[PDB]
Paper text:
The molecular chaperone Hsp90 is responsible for the maturation and activation of specific client proteins that are key components of signal-transduction pathways that regulate growth and proliferation. ATP binding to the N-terminal domain of Hsp90 leads to a series of structural changes that promote N-terminal dimerization, while binding Hsp90 inhibitors that target the ATP binding site of Hsp90 prevents these conformational changes and leads to the degradation of its client proteins.
With ICPD 26 and 47 this loop adopts a more compact conformation interacting with the bound inhibitor.
Residue numbers in the entry:
A (entry chain A), B (entry chain A): 16 to 224
Write the structure that this text describes.
Amino acid sequence: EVETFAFQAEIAQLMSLIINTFYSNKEIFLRELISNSSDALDKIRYESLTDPSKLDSGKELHINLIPNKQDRTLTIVDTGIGMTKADLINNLGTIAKSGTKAFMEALQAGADISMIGQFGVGFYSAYLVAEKVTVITKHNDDEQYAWESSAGGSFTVRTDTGEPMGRGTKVILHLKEDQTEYLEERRIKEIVKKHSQFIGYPITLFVEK
Amino acid sequence: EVETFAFQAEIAQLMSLIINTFYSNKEIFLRELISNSSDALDKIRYESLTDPSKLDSGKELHINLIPNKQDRTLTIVDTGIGMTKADLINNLGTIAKSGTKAFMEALQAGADISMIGQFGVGFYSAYLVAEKVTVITKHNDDEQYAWESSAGGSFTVRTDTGEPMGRGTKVILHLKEDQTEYLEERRIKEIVKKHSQFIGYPITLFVEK
Ligand SMILES: COc1ccc(-c2snnc2-c2cc(Cl)c(O)cc2O)cc1
Ligand SMILES: COc1ccc(-c2snnc2-c2cc(Cl)c(O)cc2O)cc1
Ligand SMILES: [Mg+2]
C-alpha cells in the first residue's frame, strides 16, 4: 500500500535543473522550507480565528529544526495546517506546472536559483542539499501521510506508520555526503539569522548528544 | 444595510503608524497589492487543478491597473479566488493581530516599513498613498461585497451594487492630493518593472482618454 507516481514532466525538469545546475549558494533551501512552514502556520492561525477547535490538534504554532549526524538528516517540523493526501500528490500544495514555467523564463530573463520562492516552487530547492526528501504531514480530519522522492521522475505516497504528529508537516532531508555542514549548529544558526530572522513563529534548533 | 465595524485595536495602531510615520518610499504599496493579487490568483489556479468548474466564473487569471485622474483613483483588479464576507471582516484574509505585533517588534529590531509584507499585513500599506480604500470582492458561491475605510478606527461592509466582477478582488485607492504621481503611466510602469517584474500573471496598465 505504497503508491508510486510520476512527476509531471515540468516538475521533473525543475528537479533536474536544481540537481544538475552548478550553483554554490545552496543554503537558501532552509529559508525556503522555513517560509513554507510559516505560510502553513499562518493558515492554521487564520482558520483558528473563527474556529478555535481547529487548534484541538495542537495549540502551539512553531518550527523545530532537528539535525541528526548519525542518520545524516536535517528535519524541519512545523505545527501548521498540514496537507491532505490530495495536496501532497498535487505537488505539495504548489502551482508547480505554471510556477516552473515562469521560473525557467526568469532564469533566462536573468534571475538566479535563489529567486525560486517567487515562483511558488521553493520546496524543490531541498534537492540542492538532499539526495532523498521525505514529507510527513497531517491535516485536521485527514490521516497522516508520508511522501517521499529521491528524484529520478517518481515519488511515493503511503499512510504513515511513524509517530503521530498532531497536525502539521515534517520535512526530513537525507543530505548528500558533501552537504553535512547543514547539520552543524553554528551553520544552521548562521543561515536562520541571515535569511529567516523575521519569521513570526519560534524556531527552535535542537542539539545533539 | 451598510454595516460599520471597529478595527481591532492592533490594526488601528498599524494603520496610524502607516499614516503618521515619516517615510518617503511610499511606492511599495503597489508591490504589496500586486503581491496579494498574485497570491489570490495562485489560490484559484491551485483549486482549478482539481476542479476546473471553479473557473466557470472566469478563466483568465490576470491583474489590471486602472488609473483615473478625474476621480483621483488607482484601481487594481484581479481575477483571483476572492474573499468571503467573513474574510473581508476578518482583516481582509490576514493574520493581522499577530502580524502587526511582529511588525512592530521588527521595526524596533531595526526593520523598515517596506518589510511589511513579511508580516502578512501588506494591504495596509495602501494607506501610504490613499485617503480612502475601497475593496470590492467576489468569491465563488458567495455574493459580491464592498469593504471600505478612511481609517479613523472603522470600516464598512455592504453588499455591492456595482458592476458584477465574476470572481476576484478590486482595490480602489482614492489617492491623497499629493500622491497623484501614482496615476501617471511612466511612474506606474517604473514601479511595476522595479518591484513586480517577476509576477507570474499578466499585468495590464490601462490608459486614459
Ligand atoms: C508555498 O506553497 C506552500 C504550499 C503548501 C504548504 C503547506 S500546507 N501544509 N503544510 C505545508 C508545508 C509544505 C511544505 Cl513543502 C513545507 O516545507 C512545510 C509545510 O508546512 C506551504 C507552502
Ligand atoms: C497576504 O494575505 C492575503 C490575504 C487575502 C488575499 C486575497 S484572497 N482573495 N482576494 C485577496 C486579495 C486581497 C487583497 Cl487585500 C488584494 O489587494 C488583492 C486580493 O486579490 C490575498 C492575500
Ligand atoms: Mg508569500
